[PDB]
């Protein structure tokens, strides 16, 4: 099935320049549709940037505020680029690759990627520390227990967490991150399990530092 | 240029009820109106194109209407899976800046069965304290409506060094989850005994504690 995947987001110093890549699978850059970019600052709304035509007339069309800082190009039959120069912290956002299918001559963004996060910042990257979350050792064991991992003190976002290499998904709660005063983010992931359900292992991955941490967690 | 304006910035209704969002276009858009649903953390989901044409898999109870300047999305038989922000989008095909304009978004909150939270407190792992800071994690799991968290160290109200974050409403039962995290220096932490997380839901409270020496 058709799928989009954005690529290239990360840290960038203010004024530095970034190039993001979008990659389509399951369909090809014909004509009759556009490839578009949309950004969304954290908690803020959807803000269109620009499109580019599928037919070989690679017509590029930008929003008023956008041209001169952003540029969209067909880097291959299957990859589209957007290149940007940061200025303000408001350039920090999630960047979405979308497809306007133009169905029946109406606007129709019927395909979206997961988006890639650009962080405008002067700060140094930092990989997270991972600590086990287990109930107090001085408690009495129950037939049922909730364990977890605290993923503390990292930059930039994101971090991803899975349990038992994605084998364990029932009863998993992974909380949205929070920015600390230091500028580093934190989040927790918890999983509820039968006290007999073997070891449980959280898998923490922080691509920006090429890090993966596995922490096997047990009670008390 | 073309500006879209979604009117009620937020809105609530019960499961099985009905809610209405409106979106205002600057000019005559001639029914060129698309809707999207976005839950926090996820990409937008295409719902409707051309004021009312349902994309496949989008159930019928999403009624888009309107003409000219005033368009309406009407969600009926509301279900917890509808908890999200909805965006209108239109286009004028004459200028470079009007190929696309998004509305500002409307939050939709769904009221389900009230469920009282279960509270867990997680004392710091044995290796945290040797780093100079200690982070205590408390969770209020699977609850509706919202709760209030309160902290107490040896009986004293704590308000600093606390961050909270709430999972968005669960698609199946509308419930929230909350983590409340308390951070202190290792020296602050070793100078106290009893750490307390207090989660309040109206007239009910659940309180979990540990004593540092025992964990």
């Amino acid at each position: 099935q058709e799928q989009l995947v954005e690529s290239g987001g990360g840290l960038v110093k203010p004024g530095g320049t970034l190039t993001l890549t979008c990659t389509a699978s399951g369909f090809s850059f014909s004509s009759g549709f556009f490839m578009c970019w949309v950004r969304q600052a954290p908690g803020k709304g959807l803000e269109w940037i620009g499109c580019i035509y599928g037919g070989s007339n690679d017509n590029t069309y930008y929003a008023n505020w956008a041209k001169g800082r952003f540029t969209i190009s067909k880097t291959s039959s299957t990859t589209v680029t957007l290149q940007m120069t940061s200025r303000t912290a408001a350039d920090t956002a999630t960047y979405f690759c979308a497809r306007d299918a133009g169905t029946s001559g109406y606007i129709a963004y019927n395909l979206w990627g997961p988006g890639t996060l650009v962080t405008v910042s002067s700060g140094q990257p930092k990989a997270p520390s991972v600590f086990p979350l287990a109930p107090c050792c001085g408690d009495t064991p129950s037939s049922t227990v909730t364990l977890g991992c605290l993923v503390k003190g990292y930059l930039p976002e994101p971090v991803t967490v899975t349990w038992n290499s994605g084998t364990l998904t029932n009863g998993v709660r992974t909380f949205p991150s929070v920015r600390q005063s230091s500028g580093l983010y934190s989040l927790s992931s918890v999983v509820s399990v039968t006290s007999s359900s073997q070891p449980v292992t959280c898998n923490v991955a922080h691509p920006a530092t090429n890090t993966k941490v596995d922490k096997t967690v047990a009670p008390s | 240029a073309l500006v879209m304006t979604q009117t009620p910035s937020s809105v609530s209704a019960a499961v099985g009820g009905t809610v209405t969002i409106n979106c205002q276009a600057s000019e005559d858009i001639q029914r060129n109106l698309a809707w999207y649903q976005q839950k926090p953390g996820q990409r937008p989901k295409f719902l409707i194109y051309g004021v009312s044409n349902l994309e496949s898999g989008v159930p019928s109870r999403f009624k888009g209407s309107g003409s000219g300047t005033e368009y309406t999305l009407t969600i009926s038989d509301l279900e917890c899976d509808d908890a999200a922000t909805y965006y209108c989008q239109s286009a004028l095909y004459t200028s470079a800046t009007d190929i696309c304009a998004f509305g500002g978004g409307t939050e939709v909150v769904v009221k389900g069965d009230p469920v009282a939270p279960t509270v867990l407190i997680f004392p710091p792992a044995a290796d945290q304290v040797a780093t100079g800071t200690v982070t205590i994690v408390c969770v209020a799991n699977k609850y509706f409506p919202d709760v209030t968290v309160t902290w107490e160290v040896d009986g004293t109200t704590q308000t600093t060094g606390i961050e909270n974050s709430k999972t968005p409403q669960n698609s199946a039962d509308c419930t929230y989850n909350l983590s409340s995290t308390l951070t202190l220096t290792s020296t602050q932490y070793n100078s106290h005994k009893e750490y307390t997380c207090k989660v309040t839901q109206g007239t009910t409270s659940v309180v979990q504690s540990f004593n540092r020496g025992d964990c």
């Binding site: 004509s31 009759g32 549709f33 556009f34 035509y53 599928g54 037919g55 007339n57 017509n59 306007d100 133009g102 029946s104 001559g105 109406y106 606007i107 | 001639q30 029914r31 060129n32 051309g50 286009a91 095909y93 004459t94």
Partner: peptide
């Protein structure tokens, strides 16, 4: 029915 953009989505031009 047909929408007021069928020409634009066909050409990529306007």
């Amino acid at each position: 029915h047909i929408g007021p953009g069928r020409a634009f989505y066909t050409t990529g031009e306007i």
